[PDB]
Structures are given as C-alpha cells and as structure tokens.
Design a protein around this ligand. Structure first.
Ligand SMILES: Nc1nc2c(ncn2[C@@H]2O[C@H](COP(=O)(O)OP(=O)(O)CP(=O)(O)O)[C@@H](O)[C@H]2O)c(=O)[nH]1
Ligand SMILES: Nc1nc2c(ncn2[C@@H]2O[C@H](COP(=O)(O)OP(=O)(O)CP(=O)(O)O)[C@@H](O)[C@H]2O)c(=O)[nH]1
Ligand SMILES: [Mg+2]
Ligand SMILES: [Mg+2]
Lengths: 166, 166
C-alpha cells in the first residue's frame, strides 16, 4: 500500500508529541516527557485510499542540528508546529523551513504550518501573522488543539493531500 | 469581517443540500426535496480568523444552464460534488468545471472535488479514479458523508483555505 512518511518538527514544548498521540492513540498527554525520536505507524483510510502513515516525532532540542538532516532527507511531508502562546516558537519556524529546503534541494516541499494550543486564551501570536507567513511560504496554515482534538485530523490529512499533489 | 462566498454544485441527488445542512444545522436530511436556490450565512472561526461563510446551495437540474453563469461569476470557491455510487454524477463533474472556468475566465479557480455518500457500500466510482481526476485539475479530492458527518468540515474548510491561497 501507499505509505506516507510524515515528520513533525518544531521547537521544544509546542506539542509535537501530544498532536501525534492524539492522532494515533486518541488521548491528550499532559506530562513532561521530552522526545529523543519516536516512530508511529498506522494503517488508515484517507479519502477512500487505504494507506500507511509512518510518522516521525522529533526532539525540539538543538543537540545534533545536523542529525535533523537525516530525517529531513527521508521525510515526504512536514508538519511545522509552533504554539500560539509562544512567540519564540513562531520565530523558530523560519529556521526549520530553511533547513528542510536546504537538505531536500527544494523550494516547495509538502508542508503545513500548524499553530497549536489554540484552546489557550493567553495568545501571543495573532492568526493573521501566521496566515501571512504561511501565504509567503505558499503552504496551508491550520490551528490545532491536542487538548480538545480540534484540527488534529485536519492538519495530518491536509499534509497527506499536499503530498498527493506534489 | 472577511466573507467567503462558497458555491455547492453537482448533479441532481448527490447530496449538495445534505452536506450544507450538516455543516450549518448539524443534522442529516433524509427526504426528497429538490433545491431551486438556497442561501446560508454563518459566522465561524476558521484557523483563528473570524469569518462569514456565505454558502449558495444550487439546483442539480438543467433548466437555465445559463442561469448558473450568474452564480458562477460571483462565487469565490466551489465544492464540486458527485456521489460515489453514481457514475453519471462523476462524469458530469467535467461539465461543471468547464462551465466555471469559462465564466470566470480562469484555469485555476478555488475548487474541491468532493466524493459524497462514502458511507454507502455499493460503490461504483473508485477513489483512485477520482484522485486521478482531481490531480489533473490540480485540486484536492475529499470524500464525505453527510449521513455520518465524515469529512464535511474538512471539505468546506479546505475550500476556504484554497481561497486564502489564491
Ligand atoms: N493546552 C494545551 N496544551 C498542550 C497542547 N499540546 C500540547 N500541550 C502541552 O504542552 C506540553 C508539551 O507537550 P509535548 O507534546 O510534550 O511537546 P513537545 O513539543 O512534543 C516537547 P519535546 O520537543 O521536548 O519533544 C505538555 O504539557 C502538553 O500537554 C495543546 O494543544 N494545548
Ligand atoms: N447515505 C447517504 N445518503 C446521502 C448523503 N448525502 C445525501 N444523501 C441522500 O441523498 C438524497 C439526496 O440528497 P439532497 O441533499 O437532497 O441532494 P441534492 O444533491 O441536494 C438534490 P437537488 O440537486 O435536487 O438539489 C437524500 O435522500 C439524502 O438523504 C450521504 O452522504 N450518504
Ligand atoms: Mg515530544
Ligand atoms: Mg439540493
């Protein structure tokens, strides 16, 4: 079957893992548990196509920024995640997109810009700012909440459809 | 606020109305009720943006194919709907896309190809066939069920994001 190799990247603490576990295990993780590297594989049916989601959940931390090259080379699509209550994480996006373009030798790589933790009221990144950024990259912007599950399927399945159209 | 003028088109009986009412009124209509023309307006929040969905629900029938020109000229994005258990409706898609391109003087108009009634088992249109068609048009393909609500938000919000990126 068709397999889609998806990679979830973004700064430390933005909710990369909570998003992925919401998708695979249907529950919200609320505990401190820094990721090194985790793989999840799941058979799903998207828009009638039977397929396998091979998802790589990555570390937010800097140790070995060049060990990101290896998982960036292999990934077919990327969810670039920031948290709407953390401005630095939004600013960091630029660095992950440039690194992905650099290792994949490409100005258009399947990507979705995800603004997570949209359930929180202490918002510091405006949606308009993020939508403008997404538009300059030519990629979708989706807001999600791993807490309420709002937008999680949408974020992942839109990325699969972007890969379908590459 | 930003308003998005969406238009739902497709052959008679494919579920254009049931899709729209699922979205606006959250329930499945299961009765015979041919549409002439209906408007629905709803304030929503999509990916953090407050906006108004102005949705036009159209007739499947032929009387006045040129009275489609008027609503095609004004629409910003189109959901092109067929039913996965009705091959003729899938074939009819081509005619609605060509008419939209013709009146909007454009080879790329915000559009989503929707394969509705995916809950039904008597499938006559394969997903692969539809995905190939969608790919040749360069637009997303989404399967929906107005009966189970599967994919309805996805179909509409993906169309809004396509308008955002035009
Ligand atoms: N309110 C709320 N909290 C969230 C959401 N997603 C994640 N969190 C919380 O943020 C914290 C960090 O989540 P986690 O998934 O571990 O983030 P990470 O980005 O994967 C962390 P690391 O980079 O080290 O691997 C946790 O307390 C988690 O419950 C969300 O959508 N909303
Ligand atoms: N199983 C199932 N039935 C559906 C679904 N969507 C619509 N239907 C059924 O199909 C029939 C036609 O639906 P309706 O919404 O009236 O279709 P229409 O395309 O709007 C008809 P018209 O073109 O004349 O305006 C109804 O019996 C409705 O319940 C669906 O997703 N699955
Ligand atoms: Mg993690
Ligand atoms: Mg109708």
């Amino acid at each position: 079957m068709t397999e889609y190799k998806l990679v979830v990247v973004g700064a430390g603490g933005v909710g990369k893992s909570a998003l992925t576990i919401q998708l695979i295990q249907n529950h919200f993780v609320d505990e401190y548990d820094p990721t090194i590297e985790d793989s999840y594989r799941k058979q799903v049916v998207i828009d009638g196509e039977t397929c396998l989601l091979d998802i790589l959940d990555t570390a937010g931390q800097e140790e070995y920024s060049a060990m990101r090259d290896q998982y960036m080379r292999t990934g077919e699509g990327f969810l670039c995640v920031f948290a709407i209550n953390n401005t630095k994480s939004f600013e960091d996006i630029h660095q992950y997109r440039e690194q992905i373009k650099r290792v994949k030798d490409s100005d258009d790589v399947p990507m979705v810009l995800v603004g997570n933790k949209c359930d929180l009221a202490a918002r510091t990144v405006e949606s308009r700012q993020a939508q403008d950024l997404a538009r300059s990259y030519g990629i979708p912007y989706i807001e999600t909440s791993a807490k309420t599950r709002q937008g999680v399927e949408d974020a992942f399945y839109t990325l699969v459809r972007e890969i379908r159209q590459h």
